[PDB]
Amino acid sequence: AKEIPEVLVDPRSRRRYVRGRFLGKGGFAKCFEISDADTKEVFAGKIVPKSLLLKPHQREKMSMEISIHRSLAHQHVVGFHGFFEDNDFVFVVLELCRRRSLLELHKRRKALTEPEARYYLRQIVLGCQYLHRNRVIHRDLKLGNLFLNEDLEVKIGDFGLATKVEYDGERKKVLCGTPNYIAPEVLSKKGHSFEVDVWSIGCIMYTLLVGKPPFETSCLKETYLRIKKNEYSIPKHINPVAASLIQKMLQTDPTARPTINELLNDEFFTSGYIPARLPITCLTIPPRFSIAPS
Template sequence: MGSEKKPQPIVGDIVINPESGEQYKRGRLLGKGGFARCYELREMSTGKLYAGKIVSKARIAKPNQWEKMQREIHIHSQLDHRNVVGFHKHFEDDENVYVILELCNKKSLLHMLKLRKTLTESEVRYFMKQVIEGLRYMHSCSVIHRDLKLGNMFLTDSMEVKIGDFGLAAKLEFNGDRKRTMCGTPNYIAPEVLGKIGHSFEADVWALGCVLYTMLVGRPPFETTSLKETYTRIKHNKYSFPDTLSYDSKDIISLLLTSEPEDRPSLEEVLLHDFFVSGYIPEVLSPTVFSTAPHFPTTKVLMSDSSGEIVRNEFCRLRRESTMKHDNMEAAMSEIKAAREKSTHLMPGNSSTPRLRPKLHVTIPGSRPVDLEAVREKSGGSPVKPANYSVSIVAVSEMLRTCLRHMPKEEYLHTPRYKAIGDEVLWVPKWVDYSNKYGFGHQLSDKSVGVIFNDKSRICFHPDRISVQYLSNDHRVHTFRMSSIPPRLSKKVTLLDYFSTYMDEHLIKGGDIAWDAMSPIPKRKATSPNPAPTVQPYLVKWYRTDKAIAMYLSNGTFQLNFFEDHTKIILSYNNSDHLLTYINEDRISSTYRLLHIAHHGCTADIYSRLVYTREVLDKLVATEEEE
């Protein structure tokens, strides 16, 4: 007997929403699946283009099929993220159910891979980071996708990735909830899903490993000509790597494709893996890469390790253009490594085995904070012994505690904003944790760049990049012109330049502080007890918690960058006033006087982050007292 022909949706040239009367003109067929066909739809009143997923009611006549369709619509309609296909609306008529979605003109990563066969590592990092961001958001909404694959990762005209097709998605109802339905696409199914032993978010992490492998190799890791053999390979975690793959790509795939769900890395840990941290990631991709491999900026290795082996896939793979001429790289490496071996307290940093990275309550690398009194530089690098600065970490903690104690607890949206002028709010828009080899690099908003080395010394470029400030282990400040760097510091200045070039070339700025461009600078006369400081502010301490990275500057600024949504809290001191700057997930900043927040209150998202900031500061102060 022949198989029964499945009814397909009957769609006219004009689709009408019977509830609102809106009309859509049907365009080209975008794709079709087992239950639905997807067309380009143009809303006739506005001219806006959408993707219309149309399902014949005859195909979902059974109660369980109808419930599945309703569940998909409900889950997708609740999601709103730049890396998730946008949900516009849904409606139905006598024949069909219509779901109106964001249009992704460049089809999917599957279409791209069919044309390209394989993708470069840089492209894979670019796409995977976006997919992970979308997935982190979904998981924060208690949603498991359960069908992550290249065909469900759609591309816009600007080559942004959008996760779509929530037909198999499920929402967890409580902590510890596990789903037991065996579902998904065979090549991407996790072993716990296959075994029906209960699965959760970790099943999506497994699928990410399959996706990453597929983009680099050109086929899924467990693919065979037999479904039974594919399932057997998944159960026994049997797959192999071609010799062409890099060490970092093999390592991250191996971590993602770990058989035991609880042993797989979290999405945050995935983004901290050397595959992402150490390799080049383009900020944008041209639509031409859909069919043609891109040509990225030429890079060359600038360092070798102590054994003479080339250091590959590390931050020092920079463009050939550099701000300085470098030689004797082996000597530079030897000096920094020797200093590192002598240090008794090494900083935590990017590990080659990120799944072993501990969930730190507070881990503080480096030395005790060094507070500077504003002093006059002396040409030629004469040392100056710093004294106490005006704002200590204890004062910052007490300032925030007082604000939270007195502020109204209800949410308030009309607290007056403070118009910062120029670099009035100094903060850290870029940073690089490379302390497993050299140190922690950071760029301040005034364009200065610094490094805390593993031997606890600090060095930084002044904003003009004409002079260098060096803070030695005896806490003395030395300032030198670039034309007269002493030989003993040449290697550290070289490494400072590498960090600087890397951040300039490869890191996206973490946001912008809104400031009054129409007002003359300076508009406010400084009344600080430390007038006109000429010692460049520098990073005193940095440390990680399980949720954020914290940075404390020598001018009293305390900054907390949250990993999950990239929001930032900046507490600063200016003109005898305490300021709070909040940078949201869209990189939009708002600055307030803490006095006003104490009186008027703040929004719920700022309040929750301030409470956590206070906890971090309390632990830091306690650690200071112990030292």
């Protein structure tokens, strides 16, 4: 069966992590709360058996994932703390985001209030500005990959579909993986780059405000059909300034979308209330954002 060790020891760094609470699957990975022996500091551990990494291509992807992620550090990106291996497993030590992800928020709250959406989107955007500035395209921005720490700060994670732009104007021809909010240029196999992430952020904005994803259907291929056609619609109860921004991000032509750097200067942000922080009640109850308590 090949057992996962109770203690994970990085022979090089000489750190030892005690394996704790199981967190769930993450593709080939089993994930656990792991804690450092000396410092007692608690991380999220991504354990993937080498028995599922028999093929060089599968190994290369993981190798690249780490390559990309180890080089990144930002307030709104999941902290990369390390990786190591024994002959049976690959262990990746990541920032523990104790509030899980926006997917879990979405499932509890469905559509958010506008200022919550503004709050989360700004952090999503700041993180992605950072990525793009460092030539990295995430290519699978979704709610499940947008983790939340104890202070409800967004942390972009899971760089398994990410890719590094190596030269100016490079159109990536391939994307091994199936992103959730997949851009039409990927689906048509026309070649793609950074605008893929702005697409996804468009879908995320929609989802956060509407309470459901823009192109959802019962068949994944019928959904891809709709993306190709740009066949979505924004409910009337959505404000036009928000709606306008969604429309700019969800255009079939990638060159018509705003760049990541344009986004925070949109009316949606600059003329609406953006909370400095959200209370933990926001996991469960919609916030009214009152001006003074009782």
